[PDB]
C-alpha cells in the first residue's frame, strides 16, 4: 500500500527502474532493470539505500563510486520511459512530447577531482547513432551544480547533453536552491528542447540535427563528474512526485 511505485503511480509498462543491489560501495551491483534481481518485484521494490518513499516523494539516492569496481562511468538510480511494455522511442519534431515532475535536490555528491558536486535529475536520451551517423546520446541533461557534498543553499541549474554541449557549450543559470520544490516541464516539440521551471521557460534551444527519432525520457538521480571516483559515503539525493509523461 505504501510502495514507491504505488506512491509515484508508475508500473513496469510505463517506466523501467535502474537501481543497484547490495550495500552502497564500489562492489554494489547495477541492474538496468532492477526487477531482474533476485527477490525484487516491481510494485513492492524499496531499498532505503537507493529507492524509497515517505508516502509523498520517491527518493533516488546514488553514491559517488557506487559500483565503481564493475564500471567507472557515472552511476544512476533512475527511471527509463517505457511505452506499454515496449521501450519508449519517439521523435522530437513529430508531435509534442512532455515530461512533468515535481522535484527537489536535497544533497550533491563530490566530483572525482574533489571540487564541486553535480547531478542530473531529468533527461532526454536519444540514439547512440542516428540514421545519419550522428552520435546523439543524451539530448539534454537537467542538472544542479554546486559545491562538493553541498547539503543546503544556492546552486545553479546546468543544461548539458547534445543540445548545449555540441551546440556552443553547456549553459548555466543562477538562482536555484537545494531543498526547494520546482515544478519541471521538459518538452521536445518542433525539434526544440525546452525546460520550464515553476511555469517559466528557462531554457529553449533547437536541435540542429535532421533525424530527431529514437528519444525517450529518464528521470531520477544520475550523478555527474564522478567518473572513476572512489566510494567515500558521498552521495546525491533527488526526490520526485507528480510525475507524468504526455505525448500528443
Residues that bind Na ion (CB under 5 A): 40
Of the pair 38, 174, the CB lying nearest Na ion is at: 38
Report, in Å, the least distance between residue 36 CB and Na ion: 6
CA atoms within 13 A on the CB side of 233: 0
Q: How far apart are CA 81 and CA 8, in angstroms?
A: 14
Report, in Å, the least distance between residue 85 CB and Na ion: 17
3-class secondary structure, 209:
coil
Report, in Å, the least distance between residue 198 CB and Na ion: 39
> H helices of 29-116, where?
none
Q: How far apart are CA 65 and CA 227, in angstroms?
A: 8
Report, in Å, the least distance between residue 38 CB and Na ion: 6
Report, in Å, the least distance between residue 205 CB and Na ion: 41
Of the pair 51, 217, the CB lying nearest Na ion is at: 51
Instruction: Cite the beta strand spans of the chain per DSSP E.
Output: 15-21, 29-31, 51-53, 58-63, 76-83, 86-87, 96-107, 117-125, 138-146, 154-160, 171-177, 182-189, 192-197, 200-206, 216-223, 235-247
Q: β-pairing, 200-206 with 192-197?
A: antiparallel
| Neighbouring residues of 192: CB distance < 8 A, sequence distance ≥ 6 | 204, 205, 206, 207
How far, rounded to the nearest angstrom, does the alpha carbon of residue 75 sit from its chain's CA centroid?
11
- 237: number of Cβ within 10 Å: 20
Of the pair 12, 40, the CB lying nearest Na ion is at: 40
Of the pair 1, 39, the CB lying nearest Na ion is at: 39
Of the pair 45, 217, the CB lying nearest Na ion is at: 45
Of the pair 33, 100, the CB lying nearest Na ion is at: 33
Report, in Å, the least distance between residue 63 CB and Na ion: 23
Answer whether 120's CB lies under 8 Å from 217's CB.
Answer: no
Report, in Å, the least distance between residue 7 CB and Na ion: 21
Of the pair 35, 154, the CB lying nearest Na ion is at: 35
**Which among 89, 81, 92 has a CA at the least distance from the CA of 211?**
92
Amino acid at each position: 500500500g505504501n510502495s514507491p511505485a504505488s506512491v509515484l503511480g508508475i508500473t513496469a509498462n510505463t517506466w523501467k527502474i535502474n537501481s543497484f543491489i547490495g550495500s552502497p560501495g564500489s562492489s554494489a551491483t547495477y541492474y538496468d532493470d532492477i526487477t531482474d534481481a533476485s527477490g525484487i518485484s516491481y510494485n513492492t521494490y524499496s531499498d532505503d539505500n537507493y529507492f524509497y518513499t515517505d508516502g509523498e516523494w520517491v527518493y533516488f539516492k546514488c553514491y559517488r563510486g557506487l559500483g565503481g569496481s564493475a564500471n567507472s562511468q557515472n552511476p544512476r538510480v533512475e527511471l527509463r520511459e517505457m511505452d506499454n511494455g515496449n521501450l519508449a522511442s519517439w521523435t522530437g519534431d513529430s508531435g509534442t512530447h512532455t515530461m512533468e515532475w515535481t522535484v527537489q535536490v536535497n544533497q550533491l555528491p563530490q566530483d572525482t577531482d574533489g571540487d564541486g558536486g553535480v547531478l542530473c535529475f531529468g533527461q532526454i536520451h536519444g540514439p547512440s547513432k542516428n540514421s545519419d551517423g550522428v552520435e546523439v546520446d543524451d539530448v539534454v541533461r537537467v542538472q544542479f551544480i554546486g559545491e562538493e557534498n553541498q547539503s543546503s543553499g544556492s546552486v545553479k541549474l546546468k543544461i548539458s547533453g547534445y543540445v548545449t554541449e555540441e551546440q556552443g557549450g553547456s549553459q548555466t543559470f543562477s538562482g536555484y536552491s537545494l531543498d526547494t520544490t520546482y515544478n519541471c516541464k521538459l518538452v521536445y516539440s518542433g525539434g526544440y528542447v525546452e525546460l520550464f521551471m515553476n511555469g517559466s521557460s528557462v531554457f529553449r534551444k533547437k536541435m540542429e540535427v535532421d533525424d530527431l527519432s529514437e528519444n525517450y525520457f529518464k528521470v531520477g538521480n544520475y550523478l555527474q563528474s564522478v567518473k572513476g571516483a572512489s566510494y567515500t559515503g558521498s552521495y546525491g539525493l533527488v526526490r520526485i512526485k507528480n510525475l507524468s509523461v504526455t505525448h500528443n
